[PDB]
Structure formats: C-alpha cells, structure tokens
C-alpha cells in the first residue's frame, strides 16, 4: 500500500489504496453485459455479443463492475439474459466465479449490478426480486451495509447494485429512478448523487461527446467523495456487422483510453465497457486504474 507500481498488478490493483476511501471516489473498470461471452452464433453475435472471454478473465484484467440481466425461469433459479435471449450462463455460474477470485486475491472487492431483462417465465413460483434474496442474496458473500460503502467494508465481499424494484433485504447500493437511454442525475441513499450516462442507441458521434462530457464533470468534482459517476462507453445501433458493438468498441475504447492518457485526471469514475482485450492500442481499463495514483 505504498507503491504506484502496485496498480499494475491487475489481480490486486486494490490493495495499495486505503480503507477509508469510499467505493465512490474510485476509478474503477467494468464491462456492459458481461455475460454474453458464450455466443457462437453468427447472427446473434451480431446483436447480442459484447464480450469475448469469461468472468475471469475480466476479473483478471482489472474489472470489478459487473452488468448481469437476468430472467427467472420455471425452475425458480434465475439465468442471464439479453433480449428474449437465452445467454447458456446462470447467476450461480457468476457468483462461482466471484467467489474463486475473492478467495484466491482477498485484497478486492467485486460490484454486482443486478437488472430483470425479461419478463417471468409462466410456471414460476415467486417474484424476480423474491427469488434473487431469498435463494442468493442471503449468501454470506454479499455485503450487508448500506451508505457510502468503503473500500475497507467491502475487501473480500460482492457489493449489489441494484437495478430491480421488488427488494426487502438491506445491504448495498439501493434502486434508484433511472430513465431509459440518457444521461441524468438523481438520488440513492441520504448520503449521496448518482449521475449516469447510458445512451445506448444513439449516434456515433453524440455517444463519443456524452462520455467526454460525462468524464469531464468528474475530473472537476474529484474531491467530491459523496458523488457516484457511471459512464457506460457502449453503443448498441443495429448489427449487420460494421455497425455491431465490435466495430463500435474498437473505436471508442482507443479513442477514450487516450483521452484519459492525456489529461493525467485525479478521477475518472466507474466506466463500464465493452470488449474488454489485449487487441486495442492504450488500454481503457489499465487507464482508468492508473487514474488512481493520486489515492495512494
């Protein structure tokens, strides 16, 4: 916890900052959909796929915030989802994977966001936010504390965002408005401002200025550790190829990497991506970690 070269350790890029600091003030890496790694198929990588590898790797790479939407089944478990399509990953498959990586690097902490993507299968017994808490969320694994959540409550623990409605067990980030497609500013808790930028479908070039505007904002408020900022760096137009999220992410990811590389800001914020690799010239989420130096 007191050398900067420390951040370069992907698998432990945490552990050099200090407790105190709230899980707000971090810069912290994340991937859009971060289940759809499974996809084989041609037409619906197209339209669904975002991601190229699986849970580990992202973790491995630096992310700690994850986007899961789900859909309960028949079953009564709940399955990742994108559309009315059907991923081939589970939650429990998710939660597994966070489990192993807290274990094997106990310095961090992994965000869970959890959003309905579909409506209830027919034959379900209970409600999506019923069956996520009283089969999931009453793991030991989950943090349990509300508030500005600090980096030191949460080491060794999944913290919940949480995107659906129906909640009755305290514990993480609560729900909060969120209109579809834009950028706002609302509320969570007593003790806190949200400000998100999520305009997915949009043009090219109003989604490039929303998240320069967006990540300018935070670099000006970097003292403000009551503040919570999201910028999503995703775009999702209409597939059929140079014009699917692939073609999309190679652009934005290099474009926005160096955008960070040369203001040298205090803080970034929490930017949730797509395609997170080793393809792309400066690197999105090592920029956003290194935007950290200042904490330690």
């Known amino acids: 916890?007191?050398?900067?070269?420390?951040?370069?350790?992907?698998?432990?890029?945490?552990?050099?900052?200090?407790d105190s600091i709230p899980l707000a003030?971090?810069?912290?890496?994340?991937?859009h959909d971060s289940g759809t790694f499974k996809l084989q198929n041609p037409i619906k990588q197209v339209w669904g796929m975002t991601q190229e590898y699986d849970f580990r790797y992202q973790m491995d790479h630096g992310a700690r915030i994850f986007d899961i939407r789900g859909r309960l089944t028949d079953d009564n478990t709940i399955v990742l989802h994108h559309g009315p399509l059907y991923l081939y990953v589970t939650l429990h498959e998710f939660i597994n994977e966070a489990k192993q990586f807290l274990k094997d690097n106990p310095s961090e902490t992994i965000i869970m966001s959890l959003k309905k993507e579909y409506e209830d299968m027919k034959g379900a017994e209970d409600s999506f936010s019923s069956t996520f808490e009283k089969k999931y969320?009453?793991?030991?694994?989950?943090?349990?504390?509300?508030?500005?959540?600090?980096?030191?409550?949460?080491?060794?623990?999944?913290?919940?965002?949480?995107?659906?409605?129906?909640?009755?067990?305290?514990?993480?980030?609560?729900?909060?408005?969120?209109?579809?497609?834009?950028?706002?500013?609302?509320?969570?808790?007593?003790?806190?401002?949200?400000?998100?930028?999520?305009?997915?479908?949009?043009?090219?070039?109003?989604?490039?200025?929303?998240?320069?505007?967006?990540?300018?904002?935070?670099?000006?408020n970097s003292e403000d550790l009551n503040h919570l900022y999201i910028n999503f760096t995703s775009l999702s137009s209409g597939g059929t190829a140079w014009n699917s999220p692939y073609y999309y992410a190679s652009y934005i990811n290099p474009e926005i990497a160096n955008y960070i590389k040369q203001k040298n800001?205090?803080?970034?914020?929490?930017?949730?991506?797509?395609?997170?690799?080793?393809?792309?010239?400066?690197?999105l989420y090592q920029e956003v970690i290194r935007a950290n130096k200042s904490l330690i």
């Open 1 to 18: 916890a007191s050398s900067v070269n420390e951040l370069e350790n992907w698998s432990k890029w945490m552990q050099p900052i200090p």
């Open 25 to 31: 003030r971090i810069s912290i890496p994340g991937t």
């Open 137 to 220: 969320f009453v793991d030991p694994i989950f943090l349990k504390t509300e508030g500005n959540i600090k980096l030191g409550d949460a080491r060794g623990k999944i913290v919940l965002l949480k995107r659906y409605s129906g909640s009755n067990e305290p514990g993480g980030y609560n729900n909060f408005y969120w209109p579809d497609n834009e950028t706002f500013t609302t509320t969570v808790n007593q003790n806190a401002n949200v400000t998100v930028q999520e305009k997915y479908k949009v043009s090219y070039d109003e989604k490039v200025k929303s998240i320069k505007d967006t990540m300018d904002e935070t670099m000006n």
């Open 265 to 283: 800001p205090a803080r970034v914020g929490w930017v949730i991506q797509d395609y997170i690799n080793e393809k792309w010239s400066p690197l």
